[model samples]
Target: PVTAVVQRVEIHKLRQGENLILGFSIGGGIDQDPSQNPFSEDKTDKGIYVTRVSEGGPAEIAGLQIGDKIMQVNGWDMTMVTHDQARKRLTKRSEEVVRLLVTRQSLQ
Candidate 1:
């Protein structure tokens, strides 16, 4: 069970220099495919969640955790965007110091 309260997250920024250890994919992981997923009755959650965070990665060094909600990127609020779009936006922008408004819940 997830022992989380969805509280405000500890915002952070990272741009791994020459290490490629900022190992993370920026997406909410909602599985928007009709063939692979079935929507029950709910419609939404909030923000974009981290789909993956590699061990010993730059993201991990920066204390990034999976299931963390990504509220914004470079100050761009991801509230009204699709997961794919958000992911693409983050990828397309080759930034040196990418900041993210992210939140993670304590789970047991």
Candidate 2:
């Protein structure tokens, strides 16, 4: 059986000198190449997914996980957003806190 779960993660941005870092990277969007996506079972499902999370970073500290499909960012829907749009949402400097709603599936 497969278990599905939704998680609400909050990553508080840290300032490293002049840059703000969230410590996570995402991949897969409608504008990106499908062959490089690792999460989508169907190649046509261009969902945004966490590709990597830096160890001991803001994202890792907030419990973000690789392969978790991004459902929303800071209360904004990410379902059909483009790659650059998603990147912009996550990189927004106006909000020091980034909230993520994500879905994950795992073997039971």
Candidate 3:
């Protein structure tokens, strides 16, 4: 039984129309790099934490929850990746299961 939350986005939804396709949303002004060792300093880089998950949306259905720090989309490291680039790659799944590496925010 596969338990990982895999998603299938239209990938090229820019043409067909959309944003917030996965039913989840995040904000900016955070480091995408996970190796910055957020725990190293008091000012920890709170990665892209899930601010919202639409009711029964793809993200919600996939078991995504608030406070989940999205680590990556597919195999591409999101660290420092531009938002536009992220969207481009995110919706470019080509009807494939989008892999999102995430971690729950906790501790200091």
> Sort by TM-score, best first: what order?
2, 1, 3
lDDT of 2 at 60: 96
Candidate 2 all-Cα RMSD: 2.6
**Ranking 1 against 2 by TM-score, winner:** 2
15-48: candidate 1 lDDT, tens digit per residue: 4554333477665434443232222112355346
Q: Where in model 2 is the C-alpha error above 4 Å? A: 1-4, 106-108
lDDT for residue 37 in candidate 1, whole number 0-100 = 22
Task: Report the C-alpha lDDT of model 3 over 1-108, residue by residue, as the tens digit.
Answer: 213343332221122354436666764324354444333222345345567778856777777777565668778766455556655656663544567776663344
TM-score of every candidate relative to the true structure: 0.59, 0.87, 0.58
Cα shift from native, residue 54, model 3 (Å): 0.6
Task: Please write out the lDDT profile of model 2 over residues 6-28, one tens digit for every residue.
Answer: 78999999988779999988998
* lDDT agreement of model 3 with the native: 0.54
